[PDB]
Design a protein around this nucleic acid. Sequence first.
RNA 1: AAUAAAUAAGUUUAAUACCUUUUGCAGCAUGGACCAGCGAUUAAAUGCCGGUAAUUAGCAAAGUUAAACUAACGAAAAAUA
RNA 2: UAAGUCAGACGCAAAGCUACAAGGUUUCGCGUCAAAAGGAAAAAAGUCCGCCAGCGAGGCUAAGGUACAUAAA
Lengths: 176, 155, 32, 64, 51, 50, 117, 51, 349, 140, 121, 200
Amino acid sequence: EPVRSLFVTLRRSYIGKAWFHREILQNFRLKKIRQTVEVANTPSARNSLAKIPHLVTIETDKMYYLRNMKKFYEQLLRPPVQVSHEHAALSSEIKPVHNLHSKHVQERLQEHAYPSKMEGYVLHEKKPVVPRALRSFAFKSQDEHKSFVLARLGIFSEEAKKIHLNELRTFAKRDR
Amino acid sequence: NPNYFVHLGNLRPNPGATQQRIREGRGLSSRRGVSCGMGFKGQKARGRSLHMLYDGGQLGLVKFPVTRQIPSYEVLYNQLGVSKLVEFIQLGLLDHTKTITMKELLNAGCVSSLKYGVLLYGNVSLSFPINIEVTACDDRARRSIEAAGGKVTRV
Amino acid sequence: XXXXXXXXXXXXXXXXXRXXXXXXXXXXXXXX
Amino acid sequence: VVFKTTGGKAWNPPGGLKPLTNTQKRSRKENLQILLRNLSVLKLAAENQPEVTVNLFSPLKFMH
Amino acid sequence: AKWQQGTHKTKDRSEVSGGGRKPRPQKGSGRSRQGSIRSPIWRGGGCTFPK
Amino acid sequence: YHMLKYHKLVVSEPAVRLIEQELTRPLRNPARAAFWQEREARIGAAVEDL
Amino acid sequence: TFSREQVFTFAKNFTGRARNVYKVALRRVERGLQHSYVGRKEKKRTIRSLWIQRINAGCREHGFAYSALINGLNQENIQLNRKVLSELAMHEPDSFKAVLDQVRFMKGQEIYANVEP
Amino acid sequence: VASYLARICPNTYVPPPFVATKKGFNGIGGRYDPSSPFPPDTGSSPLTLQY
Amino acid sequence: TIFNTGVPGPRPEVAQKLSTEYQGHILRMISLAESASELDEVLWSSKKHLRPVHIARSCLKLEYLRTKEKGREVSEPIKNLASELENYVELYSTKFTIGQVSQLVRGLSSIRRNIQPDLLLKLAAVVVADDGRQVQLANEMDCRDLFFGFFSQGFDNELFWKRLSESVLPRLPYFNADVVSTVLRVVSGLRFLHNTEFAHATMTALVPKVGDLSPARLADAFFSASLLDPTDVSGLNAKLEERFLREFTSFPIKDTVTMFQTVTVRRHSTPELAAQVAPLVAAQAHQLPVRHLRRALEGMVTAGWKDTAEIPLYAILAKQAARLVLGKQSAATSAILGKHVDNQGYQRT
Amino acid sequence: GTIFNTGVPGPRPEVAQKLSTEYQGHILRMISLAESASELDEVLWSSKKHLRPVHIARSCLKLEYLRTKEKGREVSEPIKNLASELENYVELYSTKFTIGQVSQLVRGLSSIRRNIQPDLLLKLAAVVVADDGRQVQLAN
Amino acid sequence: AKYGTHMLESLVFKYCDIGGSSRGMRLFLKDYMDPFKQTNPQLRIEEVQNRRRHPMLVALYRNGQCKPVCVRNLSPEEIAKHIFWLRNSHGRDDDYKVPRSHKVVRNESIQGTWAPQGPTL
Amino acid sequence: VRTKLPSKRPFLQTASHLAVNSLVPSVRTNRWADLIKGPAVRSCIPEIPEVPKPSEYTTIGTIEGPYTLNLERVFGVVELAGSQYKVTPDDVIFTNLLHGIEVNEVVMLERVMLLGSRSNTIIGRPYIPGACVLAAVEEHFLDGTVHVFKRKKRKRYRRYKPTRPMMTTLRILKVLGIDPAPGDELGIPSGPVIKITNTE
RNA sequence: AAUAAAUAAGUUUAAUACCUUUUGCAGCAUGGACCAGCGAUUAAAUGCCGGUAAUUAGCAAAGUUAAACUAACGAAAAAUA
RNA sequence: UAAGUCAGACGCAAAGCUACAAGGUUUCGCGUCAAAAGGAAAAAAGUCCGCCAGCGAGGCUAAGGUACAUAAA
Ligand SMILES: [K+]
Ligand SMILES: [K+]
Ligand SMILES: [K+]
Ligand SMILES: [Mg+2]
Ligand SMILES: [Mg+2]
Ligand SMILES: [Mg+2]
Ligand SMILES: [Mg+2]
Ligand SMILES: [Mg+2]
Ligand SMILES: [Mg+2]
Ligand SMILES: [Mg+2]
Ligand SMILES: [Mg+2]
Ligand SMILES: [Mg+2]
Ligand SMILES: [Mg+2]
Ligand SMILES: [Mg+2]
Ligand SMILES: [Mg+2]
Ligand SMILES: [Mg+2]
Ligand SMILES: [Mg+2]
């Protein structure tokens, strides 16, 4: 049976190989490990492959076909099977998870597995606490406005009175 | 205002007509980030020190001889080709029924700016006579004009 | 041999193993 | 590989290059079998070459 | 561009007042070496690229 | 600049004539410009005849 | 370079001057982000190691070995991965045992769409 | 996702997206992009107004 | 410095597939293909990057390839390639555009292949979906292919033609004459559209501009107008006849034969017309297929022309018909060449 | 040789004496001395900003000489493309040519079997016959 | 949606009438505001016109989450992208990551957790 | 040869061969290798057929309103989005982004590999025909930001690229294929009301 | 190098700052106690090479400045008369 | 690109100089580092495997391993 083509697969990397051996791989157009090409069975091609038998794996058209068809037949679906294990005495109680007492296991269930916190935005709304180092950036605009008002309008102004009233509210809430 | 109105607030230049300047020394990820693209050390990377033409000391350019020949003064004349003179006449910018002088050439646009004179040169095949007065002329132009029956006078 | 082996595999409807009309003759893929 | 045993750079442990283990020997045997097998295949191809070479399609050759 | 007036100016280290003398010794004091108080690096000094 | 700055433009009859006159005046050598216009006219006439 | 807002957002849980001092925190933030890139890669290696240990422990309780099971599954055309097998051994001992018996003894009853052909 | 408008409005007609170019013309293909901040052009250089 | 001795040898021959970088060259490659086998290889190499635009264009290319093989049965490779393009159309059945569907139907209809009835319904649904919103975006060329492409497939869905006609009705006045002629051909071929408002609108739109009709379209328009409107309610048949009289000498042989037969059916033939036709038909009798030869015989016989010694047209036509039936032209050429074993394809009547 | 780098042919004395001269007309000589279609295209491309009707007339005439050299075959692709580009300049300068220049233009384009567009051909004809041919008297 | 109940409660559109940064927002409202309302009968949609500098989107969830988003100098297609992720999500914070096992279950074992085969102590 | 200047020898040889070919015609006019060159083929071996797989996920309807779920006593293994999951009713899973589905829709998963109860187990090789799992689409969300940072000491190299992954959330409703063991039957309504909108 | 990735929260695994300068630095090689502000390829004239336009340019106002262009071998014959 | 570079280092293999010494020095062939993260040998610039666009609790391998530390007979 004539051999009409060869299949060549790359096994080793380009790293650490002589530059006159990388050219042969580039002529065959092999760039990645496990990449395969098909070439014509000619005397010139066989001569080149004989200079790098340690970098590649070589097989004929018939060998390449038979190997891949054997794998194909193995991967075909096969009938399912069933195995029975009888336990005559079974309990009707539903046991809990062994780590239900953990607060961290409960937090995950609360966040994703329970019908929790569905009563509305107003009920569950909360104000986040600003880290101490970020406070000069969260209140930059408000501080600038107060300076803007007092510098241009003065302290005997309607805007200034409003700011003072809001400051009284904040101080009063400190007493808890 | 409709979309197609044009005012001072929606004008842009044609694409490709302008490109942003490169400002070097403005960050690691900027173009020419830290060292400004000059390298690390040496004379080139320390400001205005080295002329771009210095070759290191060999001085190979001054190893050649010197010539002192004076070119002819006629390189200062305005050159007019005979073929260009005919083209103007054919188009009608010159009157070929009367003597042509350098004044007519200047007004017609054949010669741009005259300081010394006009030199007439070249070969052309003519069918009608021409009488032209110039300051200088070669032999090819004289034969071409006289073949048709013209007259060339150097004044 | 390649022609005599492509035909056999071609004469196999693997997509018919997920059609509920199947028996123990639709999984006898290899030896008819 | 490094065979030098002198100098302050410890390429090898004290005592020089260590001998191969059983697994290392088996590893080198299989690398040579692959190399020999490839040469055997090329001999089969040369003894069964057809008279006319097959022509294989390539999009880049087609375009130019 | 034609209408812009362009009457603007600044001073460099050679135009700022004073700064002639060397302020510190070259070596020995443990401080950075300096040549003039009107250098651009110094507060109140001249402009590196004046207008 | 002024035309784009303001929304509306109002002109007088003599102004319109003067504006057009200046926008069509030859940039250089009035005499040379006329010559090329006459030659183009003659060519245009010949084209119609053919 | 990160800005002051970015630096202090990253460093809110650091100790000492690393929390609010820009020069100290900036170097601590960059080193931490380098640790994270390496950490995500190693996580994938560690978890697969844990799956295999649990599978091996379950196999040996019945008189088997992990390497024998992996080979046996491929011969039966069973493509359950290690994450699923590890969970079966821990939470579903009876189903895990059934898989072992099929691989070792092949005594499961086949199911066909047509029960009576 | 090819188009988010087609996902949030399952029962409406979404016109084809405008062609985006490096140069940045708003008049490519006889269409005008209403979101552009410039007057319509003809989709080529030099820029000319399309009414 | 030197590690190999000799002149570099030939490069190895490697089988390769199309890479993602050249996905934009697929349409060019289809155009450059010069045979069915080459096009089959182009599609196979680009299988992973095929899109509905590529599938539709390939079917259109079948018409171009088959044209070179006129006068012979459709080649086997063309039939096999068509059997594969159909499967791709099924996969992308709902992702085509109106313009792409028109190309697909024209290509498959030219090859004389019958599309499955279920596929036609799916393709029909695409055209008329969303109250024909996309029909307003189809250009003149798309509309022409849609009408003739679906008609040639034997599509006989009354609802589809009703909706399609309604969307096209307001655009008829601005279509070219050649497009309007195709619409008339479909209307005459569909019985249930014989006496609709769309049919009348088409006739009224064609009359104002008839000087732009090409010879082939002019002949079909006269045929369709005569069948649909025996009485000249609109000044179409009268205008068409006047054009035929004025430029009778300029039209090609095939169209003159067809138009002459129509006049005889209209009962407007005269001995002068019959006399003038004979010298032109006799000279170019060899340029008429079997179908046109039958038309010529019926038209002349109805006109009443009698065989004359100078121009025995009937004798010439009989010989020409025999040659077409026998297919002697291929044999005659082979006799001069000297190779009588040359394969001779034919289309048996 | 000795003057130029390796592989560069030495100067031809005949060509050298033409180009080295005290008189102007450098561009005309460069196009007249072109030996191939590609060479002439490069000359025009590098001198676009200084081309005039006299340069266009000579360029079209040169197409006659290049075609003669490449005999035994039909007009090649480079010749066809060069002629197409020249036509755009003919349209641009169609109103500035003289009778002599128009005569050269038609001859060159005719020898290459190139059909001038009817609109442009009419313009060229009008120039020659304008003024009842009174300008034809000043021709050789 | 959680157990068939949508989590997004309200969506507020803030923009200006003459600002150039709001150009894209105005186009979206003109063309797609009405189809969007019909698709989401259970969502309270509010539009606010003010003299603020830039447009903004505000999303409020039934669990108490607030997610303001800036749509400055965006086109309708870009705006629609933000809306898609806001409507279909539960509004969790940008720093939250889901469990690494990719599964949360209340009934983890059907047959029972493995136990030693012997008398424990 | 000592010089580092590139050699011009190939250019000099080419100019000589071109000049000879231009002026001197060749004697031969055919080449046998070109004459008998056959048509181009894709390969020299038959193509390897592909192995069929069950459908991954498909829509079957929508959910009308709020519902409740109860616990059952069966479980299974399903393959989805490149990874396997062990699921039982009322579980929540997180996968990669799934295209072509919307919130409050019911999908059908057919790549079932294992089914189990308290009295029997069914093993697929590799898939079980006639089994399926139903789930409800609950979320299409962007996960928490992942900060990607790279730096090389002393090389002036620094890169920062934050990103947000795309994911999908599902809730398991029903497992079909295996009966519960005796005494483990759920004798009450369990799931939502589904509007069927997928008829083939 | 005081963090990272995880966790049943008990813990487990990974992990020798930055800059400058070097063949090579955790370096027992150089600089910085920390915060805020200031702090370094800018302008003119000329020349060269790309990109984008005007279709000669400046004055003057039927006439003048600046630039550019200006002879190379007149070589084609395509008539089914 | 009218740019930067003209301080190089070691491994295997040769030759001159040294003492068929040096992590020495001078040339030369290939490779790696320089400018290269990841895996194996204890830590590991130059040795062996192998070249990092991003995320994931999927799978197969290379050098090297398979009673404990420490994944696998
Ligand atoms: K290697
Ligand atoms: K530089
Ligand atoms: K401090
Ligand atoms: Mg140095
Ligand atoms: Mg330097
Ligand atoms: Mg040491
Ligand atoms: Mg090994
Ligand atoms: Mg000052
Ligand atoms: Mg891995
Ligand atoms: Mg040192
Ligand atoms: Mg110090
Ligand atoms: Mg040096
Ligand atoms: Mg040196
Ligand atoms: Mg050394
Ligand atoms: Mg270095
Ligand atoms: Mg393995
Ligand atoms: Mg172990």
